[PDB]
Symmetry: D2
Subunit: 121 residues, 4 copies
């Protein structure tokens, strides 16, 4: 129940997600940067029975950057963990792969990290 | 239509996916390695209108490593592109995040790469 | 001249480096976490003629985790950029590879990110 | 003694390195792709007393992409392990950071993987 809701990262992007009882993540993502405009569909999975020892809750999700406004021919996955409590966070690393020619595949994938909080930066 | 079906990676893992008309990926993943046994639910997204210039089709998906057999308290995301043709491939990089304590969060995430083909290694 | 000196990251680790006129980085690294004790040799490279348009200065370095105290059978590389000015930073992502058996090579490499500043956290 | 010498990756790039007795890597790197021409200085570190149980030898190195021909305002680090024997390899993952403006720092770093062998692809 800690994951469902709206999350904001350090770039100004916004992430609205519903966490289903058995592990589904669904929602929408709006990026403040890049070749992106409006909301994009997201889907992912999370550990619906995490450890109870103070460990975070593992999760991940994907956005393909095609919507009613634009198609960037790219997709990002975020992998990370939810940490609950008063200053809850989802700490992630991400991989953004663009469709490329075979000759350019070596430079197809960017890597970065986003930290999400329940309140805006 | 090139993405739907069964895929095999260099580790001996197996990936069965359906690519929906508007960008959804759904299916199951069976890992040959790690703290894993049986099939796990996967969900993701792909670019349903890729470029037609020889560029690959961007995609990503997530597995949370909880199923009827085991719970590893972890999740992997694969980010990559589908390359069609006679020797079709899905070339990926992945991030595997384990739920950790805050003190151990610096070592929460493994990175690697998997190449998937339509035939077994 | 902005890079030479002592840097501190969010984990409490300390990085003393000399940037040579033609691109060399040399120094020592002390990690506050992990299988590490004391100072370890570091070496790397940086762009000694960066752009002057407000872009950062690309750089990277490596530590192998063997010194007079311990040998962790591992090595980390940090890749990033130096950003000068009043609140100077070195923003990095890193890869930590452990020596593994072939069967375990898929889980040989951790990924993360460190931000270094001139003052302690 | 297994690391010293010339190595070739899947892209057609060439890596000549000397491994010093106490952990230093020095040499030159020539990339077959990207904003690169000629040889570039490399420096890094390796575990000079690896485990003897069949585990690989952890290592890493950096190239800043500035030489007598070009300056790409970028640097790559490779992190990986050397695996000896008849078909020796250095298996790596790499991070390529470009100097960027602060607004573009989110897209500063590419990630990939290179496999090096003693003979050309
Ligand atoms: O430019 C593109 O190809 C599509 C937009 C990508 C935006 C990226 S996803 C990772 C990072 N986190 C964000 O919130 N935005 C950027
Ligand atoms: O050990 C775990 O935490 C769960 C199993 C992880 C298996 C990983 S996912 C990335 C890589 N590719 C595979 O097919 N298996 C491993
Ligand atoms: O545990 C090991 O194998 C050796 C110590 C690794 C410490 C890592 S390097 C990346 C991160 N940044 C730090 O300052 N410490 C950790
Ligand atoms: O384009 C640049 O910024 C400089 C050249 C980068 C070449 C990269 S380094 C990682 C990969 N492995 C290679 O051998 N070449 C590419």
């Amino acid at each position: 129940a800690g994951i469902t809701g709206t999350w904001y990262n350090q770039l100004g992007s916004t992430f609205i997600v519903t966490a289903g009882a058995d592990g589904a993540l669904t929602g929408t993502y709006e990026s403040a940067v890049g070749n992106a405009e409006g909301d994009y569909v997201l889907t992912g999975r999370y550990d619906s029975a995490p450890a109870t020892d103070g460990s975070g809750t593992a999760l991940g999700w994907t956005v393909a950057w095609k919507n009613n406004y634009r198609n960037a021919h790219s997709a990002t996955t975020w992998s990370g963990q939810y940490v609950g409590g008063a200053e809850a966070r989802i700490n992630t690393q991400w991989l953004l792969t663009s469709g490329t020619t075979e000759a350019n595949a070596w430079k197809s994938t960017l890597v970065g990290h986003d930290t999400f909080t329940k309140v805006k930066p």
